Amino acid sequence: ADNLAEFHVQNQECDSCHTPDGELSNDSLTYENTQCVSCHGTLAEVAETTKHEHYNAHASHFPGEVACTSCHSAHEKSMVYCDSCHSFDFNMPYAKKWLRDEPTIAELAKDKSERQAALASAPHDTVDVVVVGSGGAGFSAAISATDSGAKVILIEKEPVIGGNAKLAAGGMNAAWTDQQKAKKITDSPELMFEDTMKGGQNINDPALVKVLSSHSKDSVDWMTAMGADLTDVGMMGGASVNRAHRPTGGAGVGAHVVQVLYDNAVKRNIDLRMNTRGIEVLKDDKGTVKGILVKGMYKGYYWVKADAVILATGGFAKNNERVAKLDPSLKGFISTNQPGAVGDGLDVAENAGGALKDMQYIQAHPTLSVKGGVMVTDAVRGNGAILVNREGKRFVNEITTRDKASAAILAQTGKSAYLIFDDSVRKSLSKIDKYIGLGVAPTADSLVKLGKMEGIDGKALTETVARYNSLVSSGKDTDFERPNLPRALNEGNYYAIEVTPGVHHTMGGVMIDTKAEVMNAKKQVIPGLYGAGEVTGGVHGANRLGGNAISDIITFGRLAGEEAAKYS
């Protein structure tokens, strides 16, 4: 057979997959996926039959209920979603090579005939609020608006939920929480505000940073009430004390937070629509929001009538062409991001009259795996790892800010460096076992053996770790002035991970006020239009602190949903 449908129709009728009249159920293909499951079992049941030692197409870190049609199309060849970040040895029937080629908002202007036809028709739905994007900010706004009495529709352009938020690792910043107190940590909202402004080179909007610090404990409390585990509290770069909250034992914060938000949306029967892209905010004769034009992958163009639209579409760090025009020093770099993080939401905002700010400030993460091409968490360093060069020496304070850390690594022989750690560090942060499973953390029972394996001077490496351990014992790093020295590297075996910088987070974006209301270039509010999360500018100034994005998306998402409900 040339395709999956052709295979099935050898022994099955059309209505084995389809509704009675043949029409597709909706853009999520709810009915059609139900039929796959009726014969093959759930995703978990299928996974029992496709196990490899270290990977499984049908059992991954993705949260929510991943639809079969995300990867298996019926009437044409289709792509394995995992191929957008990894290169596992797969043999999916009727596969083709991964390629993402999504038209820009401007390119879609050529659908004049089809768009005018849609706008001339009745609205397909009439509701209170539409939320655009199923990351942390979007789920938070949808839940908070619903709890405030509003009827919501939540849309996602990708086949899967979660955006970049489902990938988050190191933690969510807050002060001064019950969780911190239980771990004998002393902190304050004031100290979090001070650290944040200093980190951003004092470019941040202070009114927006005040919302970030003052609402941070409430946001940890809100997630915890909904079922989240945020009880482990670690250190990240630029923080005066430990304040990065994550699950027990040091597991990833992102996939967990998104799973909790998804379960809470399902509990409330929130209308969530996959493969549905927001195209154009609609405004009335007086310039207030009246609805939104969307494009369903399967059902085509239609519009929704609503009082308010909340843009929660994330950043543009995957789009290297756009990145390079704003910061040429990042041209040609790899990125940490999901394949859809290209900035189309910003285009939607500008077309509706919203102004942008701080767009020139773009963050590289200092430690992506050279071998696997994925983010390796800053929490590996926070919990005690060091960095060495090919000469086997330390060369930087491992918990300095991200710009200086990236510059330092690129200045070393080969434009990369190695994370070095032991079994005490490994046991303190369960996320590390994920890098070991991926095959990117080679190991040996001595540093001489490990250096020989990886091309690091073995004698120098050995002396480097002995010296560092002496500095830990004495309590002061006289070599690089690292201010936090949590563990000696001296238990069990040793590990190395080769690392290099990659494009990560876009600090700029749409201009909002403290009520998450979008403003134009004259600083006038556009009535009914809101923005929340990485799509916004002004919160993080010239440089974002590790842990501050997950804090931002829950706080600003929740407040946007409440304000939109009140407005409606």
Ligand SMILES: Cc1cc2nc3c(=O)[nH]c(=O)nc-3n(C[C@H](O)[C@H](O)[C@H](O)COP(=O)(O)OP(=O)(O)OC[C@H]3O[C@@H](n4cnc5c(N)ncnc54)[C@@H](O)[C@@H]3O)c2cc1C
């Ligand atoms: C690997 C990785 C690890 C990270 N770890 C951390 C961490 O530990 N701590 C931390 O604080 N930050 C971390 N960050 C940063 C943080 O996760 C992101 O800033 C966060 O994902 C921003 O959330 P969001 O809701 O604004 O956007 P996202 O989570 O990116 O969600 C936006 C969604 O909207 C969509 N969308 C876009 N345009 C449209 C459209 N036109 N119509 C419909 N849908 C649209 C999507 O495709 C995407 O699903 C990490 C980022 C990465 C990439």
Ligand code: HEM
């Ligand atoms: C729904 C759209 C759906 C999908 C997706 C799906 C997957 C799938 C694959 C990938 C194969 C392997 C094909 C090959 O070897 O070339 C396969 C094969 C079988 N299927 Fe299926 N399947 C979907 C839907 C359905 C439904 C609705 C039925 C039954 C009415 C069904 C059953 C079968 C059977 C039988 C096979 C042959 C292998 C076997 O398990 O005996 N599937 N399917």
Ligand code: HEM
């Ligand atoms: C949804 C629940 C779903 C079903 C059903 C399904 C079916 C399916 C079959 C029957 C096979 C062949 C199994 C066999 O050889 O006996 C198969 C194989 C692969 N699939 Fe699948 N699949 C479902 C969902 C998904 C999704 C969401 C993805 C991508 C994230 C995906 C991809 C793959 C891949 C890759 C394979 C080959 C596996 C391997 O080589 O190890 N499927 N699927």
Ligand code: HEM
């Ligand atoms: C039986 C021979 C059969 C027919 C006929 C048929 C038709 C059909 C059409 C016309 C579409 C497109 C509809 C639109 O664009 O509005 C479509 C799309 C999908 N189908 Fe189908 N289809 C037949 C058989 C089957 C079988 C056996 C399956 C499942 C294994 C199946 C499923 C799907 C799915 C999923 C889609 C969405 C697009 C895609 O994945 O290709 N159909 N079909």
Ligand code: HEM
């Ligand atoms: C697609 C559904 C998919 C699968 C399957 C998959 C697997 C996978 C494995 C086996 C690992 C090693 C650790 C583990 O066993 O969980 C791993 C690690 C990371 N991945 Fe992944 N992955 C899939 C898809 C994607 C995509 C599309 C991205 C990027 C947008 C991505 C990212 C990452 C990252 C980062 C890691 C590092 C470990 C961690 O952060 O947990 N994956 N993945």
Ligand SMILES: O=C(O)/C=C/C(=O)O
């Ligand atoms: O865990 C990390 O390294 C990333 C943190 C962040 O971007 O905030």
Ligand code: NA
């Ligand atoms: Na931003």
